Amino acid sequence: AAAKKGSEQESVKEFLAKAKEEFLKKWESPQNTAQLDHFDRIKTLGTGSFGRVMLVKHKETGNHYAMKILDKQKVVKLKQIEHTLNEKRILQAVNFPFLVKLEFSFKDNSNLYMVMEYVPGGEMFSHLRRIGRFSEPHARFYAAQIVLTFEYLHSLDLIYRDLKPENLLIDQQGYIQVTDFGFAKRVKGRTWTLCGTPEYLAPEIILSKGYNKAVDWWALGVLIYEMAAGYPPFFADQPIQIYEKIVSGKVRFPSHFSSDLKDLLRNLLQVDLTKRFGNLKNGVNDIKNHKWFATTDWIAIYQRKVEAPFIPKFKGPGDTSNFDDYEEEEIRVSINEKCGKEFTEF
């Protein structure tokens, strides 16, 4: 068992070295691969502060895609702009089985557009709120995919910075696809932007400290807790109350949590960065070798050989049954170009 795991370690190193070579080629040579009237717009699948994600159908091929539309006017704040450029450049350069695939991107007088593969199974968020909580084996299957995805991203010096169930789509085989790279960033050491979602912020973000990829491992602790409990560990009506709970250094667990699960979570939800799993000498291996993951075949997960806990129902291509409904708003393109210079690189 010991020598089997060591060889497994060298093989991870070999994989990550090749993956970095592939990434850098695309990172250095990143535009304008389609236009808006190539697609019929079908239905809004999600909405946020700066725009929306729509199901669209490519007129020529009939293929279905998820199109993220950002209103250039709404993207007005300094870090809102920089973050939009991070998202496009990162998504065009990465390649991993649990990351959504960007197909096209382009811009017009009014909007920016990113067209991605359509993942019809819905958000983990919906499924979790409907059933209440996932059993520990079910949660562990999803957690393992996030562990591998962060091992890949962090090896490329990428921090993700917005892990939560709303951003995890379930595909036709029951596996995860991470989307929304709007907060992802290439970071060789520390970074300083105060950003993310309140319930999932690490203490060092809240305290205005320069921070690193360990914030993603904290957020993994929040996600695993929420998957297994049905609610996150720092839970309050207003963001300021959430922040006080996060910095306190206290977490309480449901009585149905296994002791192995609580042990893992105490080491992920660790305020002391010299002690937080994922941030120590042995890096991600302290997580992958934890007892709660003892039954996890990491290679089998990567190769998608493990039977998923459930498969969402699908009625055909373009089926939107696994998504919630949103108010529809007309997509209007102005006669005058807006913010041409701020988004030159896009």
Binding site: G48, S49, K77, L78, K79, Q80, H83, F125, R129, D162, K164, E166, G182, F183, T193, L194, C195, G196, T197, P198, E199, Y231, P232, F235, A236, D237, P239, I242
Partner: peptide
Amino acid sequence: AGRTGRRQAIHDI
């Protein structure tokens, strides 16, 4: 008692 619906991320706050 906490937030049960979808949660918006904050870009600078």
